[PDB]
Design a protein around this ligand. Structure first.
Ligand code: SHH
Ligand code: KK0
Ligand code: CA
Ligand code: NA
Ligand code: ZN
Length: 369
């Protein structure tokens, strides 16, 4: 289907926001990603855009006025005056108050929405916002280190020109906030692959399939610890192909959370960067307008490797395994290579389990009109 035009959204301020001592979410990982892919020369092959800061107007296309007003007001120095509101909107633990929090949301959101607009106008085939993918935020509530749901806002922008949008989520966590926003519509189908059982956020059962006009338009593939490239690859392509055949979306949003990689600090999957990136490759083959977004990812050297490689995949541009010098080179020791090895952790997802869950999801997809 040809090489695709790629537009890529980055603001160099993003890496300066800080969740606080001990918090595993490190926005600095976006700056590492950017610097690595610049040093591989990938700027030669794509348009690089600085996103606008999304306004309250943009954000309240989904989020409540009250919740957005609170995000705009709350600061480390006025927290004690906002104790009640902090509890109502679930801010102050997983989702702390930090300096510049609202500007941070504006930058994340701006990239996703700017990308969607660029796709709507047919000025690009693919838009990339690695600072996006905040799949847990809800209408009036922060969750899971997410405050504003850039994905939901980007999909609402796509729905202006697209009757049917497909969302795919390869983050190790269930994309509960996106699924919830679109649970009762058939105009967005949500497909999430995730660890399920005794794991954040606790949602995404096989049996959660949508409601009302959205019944059968939510798809959940629950997995156990230790899934590897071969097991994941054998279910992802057939599920996504069946979804494409039955749902026939005209645009796609792919959340590429890198916490499904081997060695992630919060994750317990065993995927390599090649295994993860094979998902990008599969989605690309359908030749649809594609918004690719970040997500979780807590071993930051591997997040940088993952999203650098996935940018190269979007560009159909082969890059060497030997890392080029970069500003964060020491983080990539002791090997200084792009690709990673899986661990020897046991895969708890048996072949039989994977095939059985796949067959249950195929039965649900036969129920589309
Ligand atoms: O990656 C994510 C968000 C994961 C949210 C995990 C919340 C539980 C947790 O580990 N919280 C925590 C850990 C260390 C320090 C402070 C909070 N979504 O894809
Ligand atoms: O590096 C970053 C930019 C946005 C922010 C974030 C928070 C939560 C999720 Cl799930 C994904 C991304 N971190
Ligand atoms: Ca997921
Ligand atoms: Na839906
Ligand atoms: Zn995650």
């Amino acid at each position: 289907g040809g090489k695709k035009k790629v537009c890529y959204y980055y603001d160099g301020d993003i890496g300066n926001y800080y969740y606080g001592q001990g918090h595993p979410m490190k926005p600095h990982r976006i700056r590492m990603t950017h610097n690595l892919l610049l040093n591989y020369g990938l700027y030669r092959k794509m348009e690089i855009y600085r996103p606008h800061k999304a306004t309250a107007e943009e954000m309240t296309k989904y989020h409540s006025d009250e919740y957005i007003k609170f995000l705009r007001s709350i600061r480390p120095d006025n927290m004690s005056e906002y104790s009640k509101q902090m509890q109502r909107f679930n801010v102050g633990e997983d989702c702390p108050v930090f300096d510049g929090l609202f500007e941070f949301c504006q930058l994340s959101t701006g990239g996703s929405v700017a990308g969607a607009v660029k796709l709507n106008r047919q000025q690009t085939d693919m838009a990339v916002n690695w600072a996006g993918g905040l799949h847990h935020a809800k209408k009036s509530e922060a969750s899971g280190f997410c405050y504003v749901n850039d994905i939901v806002l980007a999909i609402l922008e796509l729905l202006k020109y697209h009757q049917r949008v497909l969302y795919i989520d390869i983050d190790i966590h269930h994309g509960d906030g996106v699924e919830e926003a679109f649970y009762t519509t058939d105009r967005v189908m949500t497909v999430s692959f995730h660890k399920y059982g005794e794991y954040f956020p606790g949602t995404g059962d096989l049996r959660d399939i949508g409601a009302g006009k959205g019944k059968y338009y939510a798809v959940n593939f629950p997995m156990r610890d230790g899934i590897d490239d071969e097991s994941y690859g054998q279910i992802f392509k057939p599920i996504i192909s069946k979804v494409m055949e039955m749902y026939q979306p005209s645009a796609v949003v792919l959340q590429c959370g890198a916490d499904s990689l081997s060695g992630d600090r919060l994750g317990c999957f065993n995927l390599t960067v090649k295994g993860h990136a094979k998902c990008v490759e599969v989605v690309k083959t359908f030749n649809l307008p594609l918004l690719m977004l970040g997500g979780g990812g807590y071993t930051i050297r591997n997040v940088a490797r993952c999203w650098t490689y996935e940018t190269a995949v979007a560009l159909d541009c082969e890059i060497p395994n030997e890392l080029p010098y970069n500003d964060y080179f020491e983080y990539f020791g002791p090997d200084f290579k792009l690709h990673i090895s899986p661990s020897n952790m046991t895969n708890q997802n048996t072949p039989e389990y994977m095939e059985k869950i796949k067959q249950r999801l195929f039965e649900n997809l036969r129920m589309l009109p």
